[PDB]
Design a protein around this ligand. Structure first.
Ligand code: HEM
Ligand code: HEM
Ligand code: HEM
Ligand code: HEM
Lengths: 146, 141, 141, 146
């Protein structure tokens, strides 16, 4: 997708401030909690019986770190998300068969996580920019369905 | 179906928001207008610029209908009947837009309630907004 | 909320389907499996080939739960409680899949009820399947 | 999107049998009826107070004919839906601001219409093929959002 210089600036300034070791786990964690059916794809992760168990689960944070990495990777190739997400698309679509709607959900959960961490710094225009980005990643992750 | 804990969680959140409810409602609407431009077509006659008294005025109405929903959580269908009539019948509001505003409402709470917006509360708030939205799109005939 | 005319319309449709209900349910499931491959992951242990006795057997259960829903249309929540428990809790069935099967169920009726599937009946049937689906995804906790 | 020779054959054989002067109106008509909010985009069309009024409305059938035309156009460029739908995408997304979900709905309504007209001839595999096509058109019509 195409972000304007202001949107790119609003996105990168805030991103640089992100704790890459925590925000991915927080978002994955919250997805598993807010949309329970998602846990179906993580039977090997252990205890997910409670939100506290989910959020403190080592596997979760570890896996969320990877997810964030892919998001960062995406922020670096805003103008080439299709190519960037190719193998993740085959993995998520052809192997896992994750319904795409869940890609949009995780993206929106990320946005919630960012709003929660950054407060008033996560302005409406800063959010609008971030919505274009998570929309882009979701679209790209789902290319193997198109 | 909202669980008793969800009710307790949503109650607490509203509690904390306090007198900011009106103001947070305007911010959610602005967040929606900027993030999901397609939603702007329902407000052709509104000035949607930042600081718009019409937007602030509307966020108050939105926040109030949500407070009424909360104050009457076990019968939102009844409490929200006139509103759902208005949204489906007269306004023809595409159901998908309810998910867009609900998300923006979540984002607004998250941006203002650091200690409150826990995973669990986020889950409860999410379910409450989906219930309100179900009711609001219920009169589609 | 289903209107009295929707109830009359859904009743008529069921009426016409008669003893084919079981068979049409299997066809809907097959239509779903072929059209929306992602739905197959919930039936890893099912043989999903054409003519599969497990699929036919399952379409009967699906058709029967829907008939029960129809026979108890003013309290589908109560009638469908055990089923929604099963679908959200144990099976973790992504809500979006309900829209996929509901559409396939519509397609199946349309393919078998030329005179019945009028725009109005199609609208009523659509609302009934969305109500059943709402109930079926209601226990997500 | 990519259809297999069998899917292409299943699609074109059935399509050739389509009454191009009626099926588009029937689908648009049913969309307006099954998903009422859609009528919002057609205030100039006149009487839409009842399903009978909707289905018999001249404007509707006339406009549905155009819509079908675009579908046919799409069937001819299965391998290039993006280019084919460019101006319709700008019209539908940038000018009308129609939410994309409604593109998927109309597509699914079309499928219902075809099942209704063709009966057992509209087999599950024939449908699976047609779902790939309406998915493709919806995706292409929505490119101006991506
Ligand atoms: C924005 C959307 C998403 C992104 C960017 C993303 C990213 C990732 C990444 C980077 C991996 C690492 C794969 C590797 O080890 O090389 C992965 C794996 C995985 N993801 Fe996602 N993911 C997303 C959404 C989802 C969703 C929503 C689900 C489930 C509902 C899901 C289920 C999984 C599973 C099951 C694996 C484990 C794969 C394996 O090890 O075999 N993902 N994802
Ligand atoms: C969280 C769900 C929502 C609630 C609680 C809500 C609440 C309200 C209320 C209280 C009114 C004014 C009542 C009156 O004056 O009679 C209103 C009006 C309206 N709403 Fe909503 N609404 C919601 C979501 C939406 C969404 C999804 C849209 C579309 C993007 C929308 C579009 C409108 C419009 C255009 C009006 C009329 C405004 C005017 O011309 O004065 N609403 N809403
Ligand atoms: C129209 C809505 C639906 C109805 C009325 C329905 C009905 C049923 C019923 C009656 C059962 C068996 C009850 C029992 O043995 O305890 C069942 C089981 C099940 N359903 Fe559904 N269902 C619906 C939609 C779905 C969808 C959306 C999926 C997922 C794509 C799904 C996946 C399953 C699975 C995997 C089982 C367990 C099958 C087994 O292992 O025996 N259902 N369904
Ligand atoms: C598969 C999806 C769709 C296709 C292929 C399609 C196709 C068409 C075509 C070919 C036109 C003719 C434009 C011209 O005169 O050059 C058009 C116009 C129009 N469509 Fe669609 N359409 C689709 C879905 C929708 C939906 C779902 C809505 C509304 C909910 C919508 C609203 C309109 C309106 C308002 C016009 C009139 C534009 C004008 O004359 O200014 N369309 N569409």
């Amino acid at each position: 997708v195409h972000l304007t210089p202001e949107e790119k600036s609003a996105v990168t300034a805030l991103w640089g401030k992100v704790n890459v070791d925590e925000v991915g786990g927080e978002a994955l964690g919250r997805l598993l909690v807010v949309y329970p059916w998602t846990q179906r794809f993580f039977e090997s992760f252990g205890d997910l019986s409670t939100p506290d168990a989910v959020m403190g689960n080592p596997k979760v944070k570890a896996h969320g770190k990877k997810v964030l990495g892919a998001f960062s990777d995406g922020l670096a190739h805003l103008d080439n998300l299709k190519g960037t997400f190719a193998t993740l698309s085959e993995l998520h679509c052809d192997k896992l068969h994750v319904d795409p709607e869940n890609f949009r959900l995780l993206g929106n959960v990320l946005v919630c996580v960012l709003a929660h961490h950054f407060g008033k710094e996560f302005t409406p225009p800063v959010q609008a920019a971030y919505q274009k980005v998570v929309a882009g990643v979701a679209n790209a992750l789902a290319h193997k369905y198109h | 179906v909202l669980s008793p804990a969800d009710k307790t969680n949503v109650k607490a959140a509203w509690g904390k928001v306090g007198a900011h409810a009106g103001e947070y409602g305007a911010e959610a609407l602005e967040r929606m207008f900027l993030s999901f431009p397609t939603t702007k077509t329902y407000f052709p006659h509104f000035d949607l610029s930042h600081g718009s008294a019409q937007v602030k005025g509307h966020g108050k109405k939105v926040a109030d209908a949500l407070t009424n929903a909360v104050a009457h959580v076990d019968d939102m269908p009844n409490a929200l009947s006139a509103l759902s009539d208005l949204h489906a019948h007269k306004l023809r509001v595409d159901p998908v837009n309810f998910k867009l505003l609900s998300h923006c409402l979540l984002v607004t709470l998250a941006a203002h309630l650091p200690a409150e917006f826990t995973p669990a509360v986020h889950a409860s708030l999410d379910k409450f907004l989906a219930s309100v939205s179900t009711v609001l799109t219920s009169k589609y005939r």
